[PDB]
Enzyme design. Structure first.
Site, PDB file in Angstrom:
ATOM      1  CB  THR A 216       7.998 -21.319  -5.862  1.00 43.68           C
ATOM      2  OG1 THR A 216       9.149 -22.157  -5.702  1.00 43.68           O
ATOM      3  CG2 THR A 216       7.034 -21.579  -4.727  1.00 43.68           C
TER       4      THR A 216
ATOM      5  CD  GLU B 296     -16.011  -2.059  16.132  1.00 44.17           C
ATOM      6  OE1 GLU B 296     -16.016  -1.884  17.367  1.00 44.17           O
ATOM      7  OE2 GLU B 296     -17.009  -1.850  15.410  1.00 44.17           O
TER       8      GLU B 296
HETATM    9  N1  LIG Z   1       5.419 -14.719   2.225  1.00 46.38           N
HETATM   10  C1  LIG Z   1       6.006 -15.901   2.347  1.00 46.38           C
HETATM   11  N2  LIG Z   1       5.572 -16.961   1.587  1.00 46.38           N
HETATM   12  C2  LIG Z   1       6.162 -18.167   1.705  1.00 46.38           C
HETATM   13  C3  LIG Z   1       7.204 -18.344   2.587  1.00 46.38           C
HETATM   14  N3  LIG Z   1       7.601 -19.624   2.504  1.00 46.38           N
HETATM   15  C4  LIG Z   1       6.836 -20.261   1.597  1.00 46.38           C
HETATM   16  N4  LIG Z   1       5.943 -19.367   1.088  1.00 46.38           N
HETATM   17  C5  LIG Z   1       4.914 -19.642   0.081  1.00 46.38           C
HETATM   18  O1  LIG Z   1       4.268 -20.867   0.358  1.00 46.38           O
HETATM   19  C6  LIG Z   1       3.818 -21.440  -0.849  1.00 46.38           C
HETATM   20  C7  LIG Z   1       3.793 -22.964  -0.790  1.00 46.38           C
HETATM   21  O2  LIG Z   1       3.366 -23.426   0.469  1.00 46.38           O
HETATM   22  P1  LIG Z   1       4.475 -23.651   1.603  1.00 46.38           P
HETATM   23  O3  LIG Z   1       4.179 -22.783   2.797  1.00 46.38           O
HETATM   24  O4  LIG Z   1       5.823 -23.326   1.019  1.00 46.38           O
HETATM   25  O5  LIG Z   1       4.413 -25.206   1.997  1.00 46.38           O
HETATM   26  P2  LIG Z   1       3.138 -25.764   2.783  1.00 46.38           P
HETATM   27  O6  LIG Z   1       2.019 -24.761   2.726  1.00 46.38           O
HETATM   28  O7  LIG Z   1       3.534 -26.075   4.200  1.00 46.38           O
HETATM   29  O8  LIG Z   1       2.733 -27.119   2.037  1.00 46.38           O
HETATM   30  P3  LIG Z   1       3.805 -28.307   1.968  1.00 46.38           P
HETATM   31  O9  LIG Z   1       4.989 -27.872   1.146  1.00 46.38           O
HETATM   32  O10 LIG Z   1       3.156 -29.504   1.330  1.00 46.38           O
HETATM   33  O11 LIG Z   1       4.248 -28.658   3.362  1.00 46.38           O
HETATM   34  C8  LIG Z   1       4.780 -20.954  -1.916  1.00 46.38           C
HETATM   35  O12 LIG Z   1       4.063 -20.480  -3.029  1.00 46.38           O
HETATM   36  C9  LIG Z   1       5.543 -19.811  -1.285  1.00 46.38           C
HETATM   37  O13 LIG Z   1       5.377 -18.638  -2.039  1.00 46.38           O
HETATM   38  C10 LIG Z   1       7.646 -17.285   3.351  1.00 46.38           C
HETATM   39  O14 LIG Z   1       8.573 -17.441   4.135  1.00 46.38           O
HETATM   40  N5  LIG Z   1       7.043 -16.058   3.233  1.00 46.38           N
END
Ligand SMILES: Nc1nc2c(ncn2[C@@H]2O[C@H](COP(=O)(O)OP(=O)(O)OP(=O)(O)O)[C@@H](O)[C@H]2O)c(=O)[nH]1
Ligand SMILES: Nc1nc2c(ncn2[C@@H]2O[C@H](COP(=O)(O)OP(=O)(O)O)[C@@H](O)[C@H]2O)c(=O)[nH]1
Ligand SMILES: Nc1nc2c(ncn2[C@@H]2O[C@H](COP(=O)(O)OP(=O)(O)O)[C@@H](O)[C@H]2O)c(=O)[nH]1
Ligand SMILES: [Mg+2]
Lengths: 54, 376, 427, 48, 44, 426, 426
Positions: free
Chosen positions: C169, C244
């Site tokens: 994404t 562990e």
């Molecule tokens: N498993 C899981 N992955 C998520 C979720 N939300 C976002 N992601 C993953 O997080 C990745 C991008 O980082 P994000 O967590 O969305 O955003 P961030 O790490 O806070 O970085 P910024 O957008 O700059 O604030 C994407 O590739 C998503 O696949 C979630 O609710 N569950």
């Protein structure tokens, strides 16, 4: 009391009018849930049905 | 082009100063314009509202444009004068307690034959209250006994506006002796719902000045005479602008008077800030529809609201809710055809009647609508 | 025995938002903070009739954080642990590691200090983040650095969410991923990969959700984490604590990357379908159709595996099943580790979440292995990094923040070193 | 279909989904949390 | 029926297409055959 | 928290801004009287991005009007949500540039820009943490292009660390209002490639094509086209005002979309657009939205995307949707039409989901594509420019005001090296 | 699941399809407003083959109407069951071809076929797994034959792996509408033998004779002829839409009836067909249906099958029957009239049984025979083609549009080698 003081808005405590309004909304929702559960049976008595969301 | 102009005034919602908005309305294109009288500047340009009935606009009426309701205090032009000299004829057409038991049919006949009801109010008069009325007839002992009869029941007072209004009403009433009216014209309302010459179901002002004074007595600026609101065991019902416009108010109120006793009712054209408060609890539910749209339709026009009470006097909420039927007119029309929402409720947001929904909620809504909004 | 959990990024705090839901539901804690000693590793009992978790949510954008500050769990964390910045790092490693990090990390580590001081028997840390984003990668790496110079000797369990190969994404997540590993190598102790497309295929195939949101993904990830810490929280027949994994799973100072898996991931009607026992769930834990990272372990050889069992598990049949696994020849081990397994058995079964998709099974398995398919994954990421870097695309945002090309070249050769290490260990 | 599931669906028919995914999914009723107790998961072993 | 001088000669919104949830005409029928909805509940 | 200030320039920009503030006020549920009457508490929480409460729940827009004719001021106090604005923010000249870029950039600018810079300075320091600036103007007019362009220049000289969105309509030969359109557009482009961070190119030709084909309207007046661009702008900045399962701020969208500091001209679209006769016959699924998004006839520029390649693209969805469904659709679209995307960048499609749909719609989308097909539009403009410049037509009203010929040759150079480098990355 | 899209071309195609969608909707029990009102559950599981759920029980057909003159479309919306199509599927020209094959294949096609290809594409990927396409058109008219033929060619080029049904009426000299019938039919057939997978040949002469003799109607309007063709089309597709004791899909019938890639012109029958005066005096048994099925006067072509041999044959039954009776009846028909069958293929009869009869009947059948009597029809046409072409009548309205003479010679040679190889295998 009707409204909140200056410390309430910082403490996050909701005012009296706000809390009574929210509680009222939710009680109403309960009543309409009961009414929907009644109407579903009243419709299936005839052979029709409510539409359900997807 | 043709232009109908009126100075209207509009008090706003959180800095108390009243002021005039003068208004230009074009009948041909259904167009309304506004320029503030003070500051010599434009307020609202050549836009197509087309939501205001040209017939509806008259001196002293309240019309809402773009979420502001501004009553037209008075026109500026002599052209507008003659043109509205025609329509703006007002009369006070009050009813008597003997016919109060069957007033729904009367109001139906009225607005279906053709009129306008501007302001409507039901009350119960004390002896001094009935003596404040009929001030010109203080010397007649006939009237001095009439006032005691009048102080007994629940009276209704409605203002009728129509071209030639005073004359049409003096026509439709029929002569004061109802027996001779029964003999003369059966279509006359007095002959239809009249017992004796002494008792006449409907009373009509015989002079424009007299009507102007009794109208002031009944619903003057700060006057709310003979308020008769019984909080215990009562429910609130709202006849919506749809029915107000089409004239089905007589079709609904006779129907509900058949099943329950009706106590207190008025024509309230709310502001938006009052409608938001009154409704604000149905935004959780989705059957009602968009809260913003539902509020918008309620502010789009005048609406009647009556205190309904049951014969037994135990509780009216549940019985009246079964009478009202489901919240959606489709559901009603399918499985509760006898419901009035099914009968003449158009669709989801244009439903006919609104009703209280909780026993803890009926008296709250009632006392609010009949003390809080009316005092303000 | 107490362990604290920090959550960095948009992904991390949502995963944690499912984890803490699971924890309160397991220990019988109402979300408003009270019950109607086993909890002591997570919730400190302040005063009376109140339990606050040992965690810190932190992020730079306030939208998801005050979504928590207004959600159902307002009364669990009151508003002073939930750190929130003013503006986002916006998928920019340099912006998260140097611009806003320098203003948020001091407050963060100052809060984590008096959390550890409230604690007495600190076991370790466990962090939650996704390396594709900006906040989770940049200031996460900066936080792990300052924590490692703070304590060092304490184990750090990094549960990272890596980018899936074809379903993705973002655009610059190869840049952010590589820059994240450069520090995740020499800072954390045990780093668990969890991709997204593997979870998608899991809920599509076994749980047969055809329109899965992020809630379902985070729900079962929380189930894996809960199954990892159940040995610390509850008593079992064969307990295994956090120290562990440090010894049993990491044969080298730099080879710490662990594929997770879980079984039985079963809906409410397939449970009545299937006769559940220990032999088949021990099987189901090893097929790639139930791993949390999209990779083929058939292509790789296992180094060491760990098996967390929960519920109605006796030790004779787990011993019989792993005997059958070691005698099967469809999978292969390395010639270094004849004792390739580590079992662990706990008494409590996994709980259900009302409105969830998982049924109440009697037993469950959390498998955590170490292999060379991860070395294949890093090469897959390195290739798609080198393509975009060949044209110097998106570089000017990082240099405009204040970084240079030197750290790009050295992180590139760092992963090249990692690739060589995995391929020489595989021999 | 299951009668309880059909009932839950006609229950959800009234909710407008005007709230966010987070609240709409993570909402809990007070009766949803059961008190902690020794279940029959793997506790029959130590209760000999 | 035209006055040669006063008559004007010659030949004489998108919100409705944008937000149709407000539109009263375009709606679900809200009542359906029981068999149909019982198939749909297991199908969809 | 994160802050957006809004600047409106020229007649076209002012009317677009009027419809924009109409749509935004409707989405936040405030009536034109300036009070709040919405429903959900999700609306109250992020209205500081666009409004300031003044005295008791009265929200004024954080916007600055800017024009040179009072007729525009009447037309913006025209509609409802027109009295909602800020009387002091009506900084306003009196003479009128009148389709003269030199008048908008050298003469009337010298007496108006100090005033607008002061009032925008007050609006910037009124809030705590700026996210960026958002201007709406044109590229053909005089009081819109030249004045707003210098405004952009002075602002980038002032605040070099904030984002900048410019909604700019571009002239097309089929729908052409004035005759000096290339004379103003080329100079506007010349300054925008060196000042602004990114620009959302719009045009009226594609808008009329949309309103004819997919909307099946009869009479698309200007209120409609402005309503469409407004819905586009609301779709772009929805992620700040509303929580989502995958958040995407303005700067996050910029850094995902802009691979090179000069490659920042975007083509935009919107979905769903249905005729009122065929709205009932349509289903509402993510693939239904995607098949209309990637349709070339649904783009809002006169640039056929199948005439070139996409460099990057973004899709902001609104409404409770399945994330797996979002990503699989983007992947399927990227895999089927594999030649229409650039090769040396993997996963060219960034996406985001918000939980709150627009009012009345169940599920909506907003597409932002940074393609290489924009060089066709700049070519069709530069050719008109050089055809006029070979014979020096209309040149004297421009040179006689302070400008010289070297500026025009510099505009040719920058437009030409720009389109050559798009061709390079094609 | 297994998917069939519908394509209607020309006036006859549109009116036939109108009756076809009337009878299909009647079978699945949906009212002419587009909602479900049936009684049995069996109708619900297999409406995905012919419909798409839109919103609240709104099932729109997977159909595409296509022509060049609005009269036919108006006649479609006039009658009942016309309010259920998607208005976007009314892809539609404005000029009109009018019995000119060159107009339908070279000039008007160039600006209509890209649009119909757009909508048929979008309607193709709207579903998951295509079974094939189903086209109803004519071989005498201009906008039906020429436009439909090119559409077939474009479609077979894009999706070469899917099946394809073509219900095509052919002209006969006894019921002759227009003058250029051979110039249209010869060219269309010339293109169908390399593009279409199989064709179900129809003609108005045999239909008129059927309504005269068997039906004993008084005024056989076009409504009843299209009514018979619709019942045939529902009969051939009933296997996918309903379970049965032996299911036979479209490709299954094709591989069972097509021994050679060019031998794919079928003649069709239908049973039962009885007059109303004798409607109650008759019996309903499988021998009764088989006698009416194998009758030569029940074929829907002007080709006496007793003047040739059946290469293969197929019969699809609908209703509660005993397959033992079905198979022994086929065996009796094959054993008694053993001369009328081919020798070097044993058991020339494929059968199938579905357990749902049409509405109002207890038991029905549908015969599809690939015989060699069809070469009489093509000789009957080609000889008229040679009679006109040998003296170049009407040739210039074709040569003046882009066609040349060798195309006509090509169609002659292809028609001649086809009928010669039919005569060979006889
Ligand atoms: N498993 C899981 N992955 C998520 C979720 N939300 C976002 N992601 C993953 O997080 C990745 C991008 O980082 P994000 O967590 O969305 O955003 P961030 O790490 O806070 O970085 P910024 O957008 O700059 O604030 C994407 O590739 C998503 O696949 C979630 O609710 N569950
Ligand atoms: N979409 C839209 N475009 C407009 C509107 N008014 C003017 N335009 C466009 O603006 C262009 C001319 O620029 P102009 O508005 O005169 O700029 P200015 O003179 O500097 O204010 C024309 O090509 C129009 O297409 C409007 O209300 N809506
Ligand atoms: N069965 C049937 N045949 C028709 C109908 N209308 C026309 N035809 C036949 O079609 C031939 C003319 O085809 P036409 O409709 O003009 O094709 P087009 O001009 O290309 O659309 C004539 O020979 C008719 O016999 C109809 O409604 N039913
Ligand atoms: Mg983030």
């Amino acid at each position: 009391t009707l409204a909140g003081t200056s410390s309430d808005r910082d403490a996050g405590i909701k005012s009296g009018v706000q809390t009574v309004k929210a509680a009222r909304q939710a009680r109403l929702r309960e009543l309409f849930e009961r009414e929907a559960l009644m109407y579903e049976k009243e419709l299936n008595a005839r052979g029709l049905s409510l539409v359900k969301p997807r | 082009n043709l232009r109908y102009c009126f100075i209207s005034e509009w008090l706003d919602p959180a800095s108390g100063i009243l002021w005039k908005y003068q208004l230009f309305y074009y009948p041909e294109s259904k167009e309304v314009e506004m320029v503030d009288i003070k500051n010599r500047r434009h307020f609202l340009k050549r836009t197509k509202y087309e939501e205001l009935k040209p017939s509806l606009l008259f001196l002293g009426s309240v019309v809402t444009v773009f979420s502001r309701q501004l009553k037209l205090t008075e026109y500026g032009d002599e052209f507008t004068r003659n043109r509205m000299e025609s329509q703006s004829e007002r009369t006070l057409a009050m009813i008597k307690p003997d016919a109060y038991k069957n007033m729904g049919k009367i109001i139906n006949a009225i607005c279906q034959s053709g009129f306008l009801i501007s302001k409507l109010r039901i009350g119960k008069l004390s002896k001094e209250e009935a003596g404040e009325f009929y001030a010109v007839h203080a010397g007649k002992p006939f009237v001095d006994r009439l006032t005691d009869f009048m102080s007994s029941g629940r009276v209704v007072a409605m203002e009728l506006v129509a071209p030639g209004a005073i004359r049409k009403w003096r026509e439709l009433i029929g002569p004061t002796d109802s027996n001779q009216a029964r003999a003369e014209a059966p279509g006359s309302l007095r002959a239809q719902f009249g017992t004796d010459k002494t008792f006449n179901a409907c009373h009509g002002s015989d002079a424009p000045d007299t009507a102007a004074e009794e109208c002031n007595f009944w619903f003057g600026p700060g006057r709310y005479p003979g308020k008769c609101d019984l909080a215990a065991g009562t429910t609130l019902c709202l006849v919506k602008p749809h029915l107000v416009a089409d004239g089905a108010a007589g079709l609904v109120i006779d129907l509900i008077q058949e099943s329950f006793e009706v106590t207190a009712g008025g024509l309230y054209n709310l502001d938006r800030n009052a409608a938001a408060e009154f409704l604000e609890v149905y935004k959780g539910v989705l059957p009602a529809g968009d809260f913003n749209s539902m509020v918008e339709q309620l502010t789009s026009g005048a609406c009647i609201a009556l205190e309904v009470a049951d014969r037994d006097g135990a509780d009216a909420v549940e019985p009246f809710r079964q009478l009202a039927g489901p919240l959606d007119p489709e559901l009603g029309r399918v499985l509760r055809p006898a419901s009035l929402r099914a009968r003449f409720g158009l669709d989801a947001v244009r439903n006919g009647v609104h009703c209280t929904d909780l026993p803890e909620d009926g008296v709250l809504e009632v006392n609010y609508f009949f003390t809080i909004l009316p005092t303000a | 025995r107490e362990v604290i959990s920090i959550h960095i990024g948009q992904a991390g705090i949502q995963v944690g938002n499912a984890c803490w839901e699971l924890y309160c539901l397991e220990h019988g804690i109402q979300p408003d903070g009270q019950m109607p000693d086993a909890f002591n590793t997570f919730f400190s009992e302040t005063g009376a009739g109140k339990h606050v978790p040992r965690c810190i949510f932190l992020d730079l954008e306030p939208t998801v954080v005050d979504e928590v500050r207004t959600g159902t769990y307002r009364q669990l964390f009151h508003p002073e642990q939930l750190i929130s910045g003013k503006e986002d790092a916006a998928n920019n490693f340099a912006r998260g590691h140097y611009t806003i990090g320098k203003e948020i990390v001091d407050l963060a580590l100052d809060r984590i200090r008096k959390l550890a001081d409230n604690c007495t028997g600190l076991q370790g840390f466990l962090v939650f983040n996704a390396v594709g984003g900006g906040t989770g990668s940049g200031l996460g790496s900066l936080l792990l650095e300052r924590l490692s110079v703070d304590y060092g000797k304490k184990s750090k369990l990094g549960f990272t969410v890596y980018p899936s190969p074809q379903v993705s994404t973002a655009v610059v997540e190869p840049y952010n991923s590589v820059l994240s590993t450069h520090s995740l190598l020499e800072h954390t102790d045990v780093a668990v990969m969890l991709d997204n497309e593997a979870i998608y295929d899991i809920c599509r195939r076994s749980l047969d959700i055809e329109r899965p949101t992020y809630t379902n993904l985070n729900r079962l990830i929380a189930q894996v984490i809960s199954s990892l810490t159940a040995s610390l929280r509850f008593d079992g027949a064969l307990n295994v604590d956090i120290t562990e994994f440090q010894t049993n799973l990491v044969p080298y100072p730099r080879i710490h990357f662990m594929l997770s898996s879980y079984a039985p991931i079963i809906s409410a009607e397939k449970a009545y379908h299937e006769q559940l026992s220990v032999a088949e769930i021990t099987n189901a834990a090893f097929e790639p159709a139930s791993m949390m990272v999209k990779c083929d372990p058939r292509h790789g050889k296992y180094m060491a595996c760990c098996l967390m069992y929960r519920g109605d598990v006796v030790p004779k049949d787990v011993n019989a099943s792993v005997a059958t696994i070691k005698t099967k020849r469809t999978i292969q081990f390395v010639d270094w580790c004849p004792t390739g397994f580590k079992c662990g058995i706990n008494y409590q079964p996994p709980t259900v979440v009302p409105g969830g998709d998982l049924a109440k099974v009697q037993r469950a398995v959390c498998m955590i292995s170490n292999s060379t398919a991860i070395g294949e994954i890093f090469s897959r990421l390195d290739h798609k990094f080198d393509l975009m870097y060949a044209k110097r695309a998106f570089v000017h945002w990082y240099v405009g923040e204040g970084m240079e090309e030197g750290e790009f070249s050295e992180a590139r050769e760092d992963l090249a070193a990692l690739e060589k290490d995995f391929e020489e260990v595989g021999a | 279909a299951a009668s309880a599931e059909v009932e839950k669906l006609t229950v959800k028919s009234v909710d407008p989904r005007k709230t966010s995914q987070y609240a709409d999914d993570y909402h809990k009723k007070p009766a949803d949390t059961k008190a902690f107790s020794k279940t029959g998961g793997g506790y029959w072993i130590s209760q000999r | 029926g035209i006055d040669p001088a006063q008559h004007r000669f010659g030949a004489v919104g998108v919100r409705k297409a944008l937000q149709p949830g407000l539109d009263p005409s375009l709606q679900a029928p809200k009542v359906l055959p029981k068999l149909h909805e019982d198939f749909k509940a297991t199908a969809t | 928290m994160r802050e957006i200030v809004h600047i409106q320039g020229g007649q076209c920009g002012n009317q677009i801004g009027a419809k924009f503030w109409e749509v935004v006020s409707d989405e936040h549920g405030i009536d034109p009287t300036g009070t709040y009457h919405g429903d959900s508490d999700l609306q109250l929480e992020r209205i500081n991005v666009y409004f300031n409460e003044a005295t008791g729940g009265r929200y004024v827009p954080r916007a600055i009007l800017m024009d040179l004719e009072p007729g525009t001021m009447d037309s913006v106090r025209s509609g409802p949500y027109g009295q909602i604005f800020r009387p002091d923010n009506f900084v306003f000249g009196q003479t009128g540039a009148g389709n003269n870029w030199a008048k908008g950039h050298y003469t009337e600018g010298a007496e108006l820009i100090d005033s607008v810079l002061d009032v925008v300075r007050k609006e910037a320091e009124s809030c705590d943490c700026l996210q960026g600036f958002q201007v709406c103007h044109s590229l053909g007019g005089g009081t819109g292009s030249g004045m707003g362009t210098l405004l952009i220049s002075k602002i980038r000289e002032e605040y070099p660390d904030r984002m900048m969105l410019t909604f700019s309509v571009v002239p097309s030969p089929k729908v052409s209002d004035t005759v000096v359109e290339p004379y103003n557009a080329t100079l506007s482009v010349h300054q925008l490639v060196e000042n602004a961070d990114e620009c959302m190119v719009l045009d009226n030709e594609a808008l009329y094509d949309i309103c004819f084909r997919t909307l099946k309207l009869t009479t698309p007046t200007f209120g409609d086209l402005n309503h469409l661009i407004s819905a586009v702008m609301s779709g772009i900045t929805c992620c700040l005002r509303f929580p989502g399962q995958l958040n995407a701020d303005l700067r996050k969208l910029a850094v995902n979309l802009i691979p090179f500091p000069r490659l920042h001209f975007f083509m935009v679209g919107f979905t769903p657009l249905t005729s009122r006769g065929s709205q009932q016959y349509r289903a509402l699924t993510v693939p239904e939205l995607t098949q209309q998004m990637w349709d070339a006839k649904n783009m809002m520029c006169a640039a056929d995307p199948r005439h070139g390649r996409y460099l990057t693209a973004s899709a902001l969805f609104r409404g409770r949707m399945s994330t797996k469904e979002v990503d699989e659709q983007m992947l399927n679209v990227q895999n089927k039409n594999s030649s229409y995307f650039v090769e040396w960048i993997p996963n060219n499609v960034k996406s985001s989901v918000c939980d709150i749909p627009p009012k009345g719609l169940k599920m909506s989308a907003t597409f932002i594509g940074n393609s290489t097909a924009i060089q066709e539009m700049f070519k069709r403009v530069s050719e008109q420019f050089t055809a006029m410049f070979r014979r020096k037509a209309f040149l004297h009203w421009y040179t006689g005001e302070g400008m010289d010929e070297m500026e025009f040759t510099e505009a040719e150079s920058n437009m030409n090296d720009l389109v050559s480098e798009y061709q390079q990355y094609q």
